[PDB]
Amino acid sequence: SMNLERLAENTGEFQEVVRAFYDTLDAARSSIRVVRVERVSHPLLQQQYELYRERLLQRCERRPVEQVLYHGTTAPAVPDICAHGFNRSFCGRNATVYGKGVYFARRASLSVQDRYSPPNADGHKAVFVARVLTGDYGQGRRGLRAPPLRGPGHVLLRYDSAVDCICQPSIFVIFHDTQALPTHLITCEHV
Ligand SMILES: C[C@]1(c2nc3cccc(C(N)=O)c3[nH]2)CCCN1
Structure with missing residues (x-):
């Protein structure tokens, strides 16, 4: 099993991934076309991620503990994410407004x-x-190197992730190597 393989278009998995993507495209739904979908394989990261998930299901209060989210990137960054996962040390010096x-x-x-x-x-x-x-x-907030502090009324000292807005979050920021697993790569274009 190679690290990146084309997902066959005669599968339920292809139809489900494309439907979830179009369902959250909002005003861009009629101006974006899917070119192809590929499956990502990283056995070591998947096994380390699944152990972290089991620990959080036993400890954490809020349900769900896991979400399916999107991450846009540049064409040259694709091979490194497939081979090693996501890495906070490559965040850069520009627009790190939530940490x-x-x-x-x-x-x-x-x-x-x-x-x-x-x-x-x-x-x-x-x-x-x-x-x-x-x-x-x-x-x-700018400058965070790990998730923010919980403060009084909590035994644990830090949260698991950071967000733009605590009431209706639209952006999530992760600060640990095994806390996010890439599963698919969607290649798309403007109509
Ligand atoms: C600009 C920055 C970034 N902010 C985002 C907010 C929502 C989505 C994405 C994404 N990649 O899909 C973002 N990427 C922060 C540091 C380098 N990337």
Whole structure:
């Protein structure tokens, strides 16, 4: 099993991944076309992620502890994410407004913007689909190196993730190597 393989279009899995992507494209639904879908395989990261998930299901209060989220990226960054997973140390110096972590969107309409998934010379855009252990979340801010502090009224000292808004979150920020698993890569383009 190779790290990146084309997903056959005669499968229920292909139809389900494409339907969830279109369901959260909002105003961009009629201007985006799917070119192909690929399955990501990283056996060591998947096994380490599943152990973290089991621990969170036993400890965490909020349900669900896991969410399916989107991550737009550049064409040259694709092989490194497939081979090693997501890495907060490569966040860069620009626009880390909710901390030095890896950023995920609840809605495909955010990650499909050219500022997050810029097209290559052939017009193709890269958007990963990932299983993310969001658990209990707190407010994100610039300079965070780990999730924010819980404060008084809690035994645990830090949250599991950071967000843009604590009431209706649209962006989640992750600060641990085994807390997000890339499962699919959607290649898309402007109609
Ligand atoms: C600009 C930055 C980023 N912010 C995002 C907010 C929502 C979605 C994504 C995404 N990639 O789909 C974001 N990426 C932060 C540090 C380097 N990437």
